[PDB]
Symmetry: D2
Subunit: 115 residues, 4 copies
Amino acid sequence: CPLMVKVLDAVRGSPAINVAMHVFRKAADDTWEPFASGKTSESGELHGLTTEEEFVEGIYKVEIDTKSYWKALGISPFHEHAEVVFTANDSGPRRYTIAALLSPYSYSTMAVVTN
Amino acid sequence: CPLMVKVLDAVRGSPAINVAMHVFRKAADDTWEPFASGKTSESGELHGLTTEEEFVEGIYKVEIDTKSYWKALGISPFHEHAEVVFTANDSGPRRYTIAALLSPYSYSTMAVVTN
Amino acid sequence: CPLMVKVLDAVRGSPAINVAMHVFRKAADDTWEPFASGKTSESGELHGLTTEEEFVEGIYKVEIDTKSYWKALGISPFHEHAEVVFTANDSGPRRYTIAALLSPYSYSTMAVVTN
Amino acid sequence: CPLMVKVLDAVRGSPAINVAMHVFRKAADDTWEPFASGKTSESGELHGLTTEEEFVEGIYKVEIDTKSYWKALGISPFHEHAEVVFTANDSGPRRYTIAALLSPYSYSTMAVVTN
């Protein structure tokens, strides 16, 4: 699998578990088409979203549902979601690891891109 | 004005100058409608996007055109743009400051909400 | 004054008020000597730590007393304090703004150096 | 091993390889005693710094040598090092994963603490 997402909780110092996320891919008509979705495990990671064959070049958006995550922990956060928008595989296949670090009023996102 | 955006460049250690950004409000049909836009100043700030009268409760999105900023610097970036999506709520008097810290493969965003 | 420090709280979405900080300069014997100190204001800022005359080239450390800030809020933190260690260099006229974004198990720091 | 450090480079979107770090432990006389040291591998991780037996309760400091890392890549960064100071094992043994995300003028650090 060439796309993995890892989410961490900066309030608890732990993986962010059961975080839902939705991946979209921009279509020829410039609309966002649903591509894949899932939720993080006990390790805060979401594996198996796609395959090398299906993950063609394109513009992808990973929408991490942070508001639902915080609300279930009793926190009313600032953001609706954390978004990561990027062009993938523009120069051939790559493996992408997207990491998100969450706090109620802030988030950081990092991508590790390997060949 | 109740909304200000500040953008910083973690590669140069400076304000991110001349960064374009577009603000959208979620409409009835669940689509994003243009609301305001501009480019950051020499201080990396964008003031005067809206007014207390126009900035009613709702869901807003701030799209920061980070890829165009890094291309102008000759640095290959990961993200197409940075997005900050949030709900504006009238829980007494409020001012919103959205800060974005940019790096080529990472971004951090923070929201300061004050009375 | 050529050095300013700003501290923000990512749990509350606010300036971090009344945070103590201590600034040190590295001495001849390679030890850290007190140089300046204070507490952040209602805006989360600490101005007037030093002057152009006193702030000569050298290695400085800013220790931000974050654990005491989180204890006052009743939140269990990871770090004892945050540290920012850097060299001040006279490469023409300069102003240094050190920003710190705090969460209980994470911290981010940024330096804006301007002419 | 109850202590692991992972370092990532936000300019390249990759693990930060060959990053040296030194761990210190505060002694009874309030001085920092050398505890362990090593450098990150190709994955940006440093494993095997200590054992459950040697990693007793105390105040530890992980000094990550970021300036040397950036200089070898042709960048003159702001910070001398990234520091992580924390009390370990105060409520019994824990496993600590410290993550640092580096840019030339900024760094973020996160700790995942597990039982």
